Write a structure and sequence with these properties.
This is part of a larger assembly, with one copy of chain A (658 residues) and two copies of chain B (144 residues).
Chain A lengths: L1 E7 L3 H14 L9 E7 L6 H14 L3 E4 L12 H9 L4 E3 L16 E3 L5 H13 L6 E4 L2 H18 L17 H8 L5 E5 L2 H13 L8 E3 L8 H4 L6 E5 L5 H19 L22 H9 L24 E6 L4 E7 L4 E3 L22 E6 L6 E4 L21 E6 L10 E8 H12 L3 E6 L9 E2 L6 E2 L2 H7 L5 E7 L2 H6 L7 E7 L1 E2 L11 H4 L7 E2 L5 H8 L4 H7 L7 H9 L5 E5 H10 L3 E2 L5 E9 L8 H12 L2 H10 L4
Parallel strand pairs in A: 1-2, 1-3, 3-4, 4-5, 6-7, 7-8, 13-17, 13-20, 23-24
Antiparallel strand pairs in A: 9-10, 10-11, 11-12, 14-16, 15-16, 18-19, 20-26, 21-24, 21-26, 22-25
Helix pairs in contact in A: 1-9, 2-3, 4-5
Chain B lengths: L5 H14 L4 E6 L6 H12 L6 E7 L9 H5 L6 E5 L2 H13 L8 E4 L19 E2 L11
Parallel strand pairs in B: 1-2, 1-3, 3-4, 4-5
Helix pairs in contact in B: 1-2
Classes of the chains: A alpha/beta (658), B alpha/beta (144).
Protein name (chains B, C): Glutamate receptor ionotropic, NMDA 2A
Subcellular location (chains B, C): Cell projection, Dendritic spine; Cell membrane; Synapse; Postsynaptic cell membrane
Organism (chains B, C): Rattus norvegicus (Rat)
């Protein structure tokens, strides 16, 4: 007829308040014959013998609830873990009250741990409420604590599942280092300014000093931190105008103890109304039998619904967290904490105080500034991308064409040869041609600067297994684009269904098919329907560029596996290698686009194309995902389609013959 | 520890599914903890495998099933291979509902991990004869 | 008596299906008597039609359903038009089971005979709004 409650509490005044709450718990519950005893223990500066003393004292006491209520501990470990593990050996609920670590959220590790405080990842949902208010989509994540970093990434993907957007940059590294400013500058070069930080006080002060020295706290830079990042020297190193969070009664222990007493008391009076009552045995000596109503009492604690307390509607979810939590939103106005918002369990309301930002006006700074210098990457296409070495030092010889058109070149940067050939030789040379004039037309239509560089290899990019952990990766232009080093691929991109699933496409500027390059008895082949090419031999030598989209289009064709097995022994690096090889009469056929070989037939009369025209497709501009550089650029491309500028580009290279 | 984690075990089970061309499957996840890592590992493995897995959407749970809202999600199942991540006392009720809904047919498969399959002696009669399990408990190599 | 028969009503319902080109359908028959003549009349009508109907196999019920073996035949239903022949008492359970299955969709039509369509006043809440029925109940021509 007795119920024992164990507690690890230090101060005698709060012990007296705890005993007073135990005494007042039996007030409104009638004259029932249940009794409530409480046993509180102090704290030795160690942790092993503390765990020993507490575990054998609570075995000898046979308690039902175990409480740890020590915020101001000098050790920064904050580990009530061993007593919770010892109670989880017999499945006894330990109600943690102080820490908010995400390692306690794993119920597979902490089998019988409950708590009335949520982890900080729920604050990101509050920050998602910022996304419900300030209408901001692209974020920049920075988490140093990797024990909670996977849970923060999980919660972030759970929040972004609704809008189906993507985080622009995520970062995880070892806490303790200092040279993280390179990734800060890489995030600075991005369009967004939203900064989400999840670390301890030392790394927060380190990144505050790094933003202060590099002036990343100017206009438009969105800063959004929590309670751990506004304490200690991080509060001293914080810039003025930063927005932070505050836990209402997060450190106020006296009402929190009474709330915990009310929760435990109503849980015990709920459990007394049901059958199958079991008791914890004397597990110190000769008792390893588990307490059989562990998950039963846990299920009692799952449906615990309350209506008493100064905090309010305390309620457990499936994770045993805190529902309907009042939060405060603070601002740092001239090294002074100024309250600028309140938060109920679903909605943010700013108070009568104004919101003064570190940049300009008091309204929200739209920190989504698009890149005025679009990084352009391309492959060396032979009739389209002419690359010429410089004359004296980084210069371009301004030669004139035969039609009175001056060639407007650009200073591009490119490697010299392949990686076994050239170890490291990347020089700036002169790029011009077809798509360069297309980019000149785009820069004439819309005012934006650019940065033309070249892809490191001579491949488009295929979907290949990386050599560890069985993961798909891309390479080439797609590998340089998806890594964030490139912005817009201006190249004759072969449009297919696979790449449409991953990135968005624009309107095609080129429209052509496929053809066969031969040299001039049947000297022609007339397409794929030659039966000798269905079952080839060592005579008809035909191949294509290694890691090309033509090979992917043939890989989708499940009835031409013989050509896929035949052409893999003769794939070349570039198409010019195939031109030189068939120039020496070593090749016999080559599947390639139409107008390139038409221009090369206009250059060299021995180069002969075939008669058929299959795979009538289009080539456009390689693009990113949903972006404001899509609609206006596509309208500019269609404006180039409707006028005679396509005919002008034909007059430059296509219509011009010899 | 000298053991085998659930991630490498999921890798082995998806290797089994790749070696059998069992590409049309489903996934039922309960409220047993350590489950979102399992879902995310399945998502990354499907995104990093040459199969292109035809995966039905995840049947999620909230509590012990009322057989009112979980019934609709279980009646969405029409695929053969069924994956599950739960405890044993949950799996008894899951297999009882699956036999009650007829999900234990000859076409339908059931692959469970080693954490739900406990003692070799304690086998309740509600288990389907043909239940696929993967455990590192090798009787050929003793403790010595 | 007057009016049509169940065979002429089946002819009218197949004329409805012919006028709308709903050629992919099914047939679900319960243990209400006169059912083998109904199935044989449908077979001879498909065999005497200019359509070339796509008829799924007949789902035959046995007793009050355990929702174990009948659900296997109900999950085989991939067609659009569902043809049900039963009484008024079993129709509530069949429509509730089909709603639990999710087989009461927008493309999943329901055409019922006249005898299951009972009282105009007594309408249970398990009827889909759009339930197709055929009966000789004409209000424009009275008894006189």
């Amino acid at each position: 007829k007795i119920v024992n409650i164990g507690a690890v509490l230090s101060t005698r005044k709060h012990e007296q308040m705890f005993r007073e709450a135990v005494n007042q718990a039996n007030k409104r519950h009638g004259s029932w014959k249940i009794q409530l005893n409480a046993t509180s223990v102090t704290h030795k500066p160690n942790a092993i013998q503390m765990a020993l003393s507490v575990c054998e004292d609570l075995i000898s006491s046979q308690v039902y609830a175990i409480l740890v209520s020590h915020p101001p501990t000098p050790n920064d470990h904050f580990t009530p873990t061993p007593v919770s593990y010892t109670a989880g050996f017999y499945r006894i609920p330990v109600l943690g009250l102080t820490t908010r670590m995400s390692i306690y959220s794993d119920k597979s590790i902490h089998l019988s741990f409950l708590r009335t405080v949520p982890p900080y990842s729920h604050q990101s949902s509050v920050w998602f409420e910022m996304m419900r208010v300030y209408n901001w989509n692209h974020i920049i994540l920075l988490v140093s604590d990797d024990h909670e970093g996977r849970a923060a990434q999980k919660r972030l993907e759970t929040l972004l599942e609704e809008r189906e957007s993507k985080a622009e940059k995520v970062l995880q590294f070892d806490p303790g280092t200092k040279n993280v400013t390179a990734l800060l500058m890489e995030a600075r070069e991005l369009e967004a300014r939203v900064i989400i930080l999840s670390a301890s006080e030392d790394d927060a002060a380190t990144v505050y000093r790094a933003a202060a020295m590099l002036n990343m706290t100017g206009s438009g830079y969105v800063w959004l931190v929590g309670e751990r990042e506004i304490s200690g020297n991080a509060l001293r190193y914080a810039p003025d105008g930063i927005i932070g969070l505050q836990l209402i009664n997060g450190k106020n222990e006296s009402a929190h103890i009474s709330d915990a007493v009310g929760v435990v008391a109503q849980a015990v009076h709920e459990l007394l109304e049901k059958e199958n009552i079991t008791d914890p045995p004397r597990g110190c000596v000769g008792n390893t039998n588990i307490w059989k109503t562990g998950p039963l009492f846990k299920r009692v604690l799952m449906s615990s619904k309350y209506a008493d307390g100064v905090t309010g509607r305390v309620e457990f979810n499936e994770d045993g967290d805190r529902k309907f939590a009042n939060y405060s939103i603070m601002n740092l106005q001239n090294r002074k904490l100024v309250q600028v918002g309140i938060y109920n369990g679903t909605h943010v309301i700013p108070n009568d105080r104004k919101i003064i930002w570190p940049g300009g006006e008091t309204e929200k700074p739209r920190g989504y500034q698009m890149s005025t210098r679009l990084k352009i990457v391309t492959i060396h296409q032979e009739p389209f991308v002419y690359v010429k070495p410089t004359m004296s030092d980084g210069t371009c010889k301004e030669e004139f064409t035969v039609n009175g058109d001056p060639v407007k070149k650009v200073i591009c940067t490119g490697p010299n040869d392949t990686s076994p050939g050239s170890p490291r030789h990347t020089v700036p040379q002169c790029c011009y041609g077809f798509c360069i004039d297309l980019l000149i037309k785009l820069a004439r239509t819309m005012n934006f600067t650019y940065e033309v560089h070249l892809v490191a290899d001579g491949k488009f990019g295929t979907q290949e297994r990386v050599n560890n952990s069985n993961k798909k990766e891309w390479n080439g232009m797609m590998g340089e684009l998806l890594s964030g080093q490139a912005d817009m691929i201006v190249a004759p991109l072969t449009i297919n269904n696979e790449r449409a699933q991953y990135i968005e496409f624009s309107k095609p500027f080129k429209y052509q098919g496929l053809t066969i390059l031969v040299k001039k008895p049947e000297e022609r082949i007339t397409g794929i329907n030659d039966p000798r090419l269905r079952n080839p031999s060592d005579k008809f030598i035909y191949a294509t560029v290694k890691q090309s989209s033509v090979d992917i289009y043939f890989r989708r064709q499940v009835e031409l596996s013989t050509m896929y097995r035949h052409m893999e022994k003769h794939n070349y690096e570039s198409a010019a290698e195939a031109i030189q090889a068939v120039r020496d009469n070593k090749l016999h056929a080559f599947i390639w686009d139409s107008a390139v070989l038409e221009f090369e037939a206009s250059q060299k009369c021995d180069l002969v194309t075939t008669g058929e025209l299959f795979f009538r497709s289009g080539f456009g501009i390689g693009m990113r995902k949903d972006s404001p550089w899509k609609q206006n650029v596509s309208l500019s491309i269609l404006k180039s389609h409707e006028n005679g500028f396509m005919e002008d580009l034909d007059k430059t290279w296509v219509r011009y013959q010899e | 520890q000298f053991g085998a984690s659930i991630q490498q075990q999921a890798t082995v089970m998806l290797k089994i599914m790749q070696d059998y061309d069992w590409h049309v499957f489903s996934l039922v996840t309960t409220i047993f903890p350590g489950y979102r890592d399992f879902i995310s590992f399945i998502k990354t493995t499907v995104d990093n495998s040459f199969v292109g897995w035809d995966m039905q959407n995840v049947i999620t749970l909230d509590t012990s099933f009322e057989d009112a809202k979980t019934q609709v999600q279980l009646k969405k199942i029409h695929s053969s291979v069924i994956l599950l991540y739960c405890s044993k006392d949950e799996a008894v009720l899951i297999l009882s509902e699956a036999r009650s809904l007829g999900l234990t047919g000859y076409d339908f498969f059931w692959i469970v991990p080693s954490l739900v399959s406990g003692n070799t002696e304690l086998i309740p009669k509600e288990f389907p004869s043909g239940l696929i399990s993967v455990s590192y408990d090798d009787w050929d190599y003793s403790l010595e």
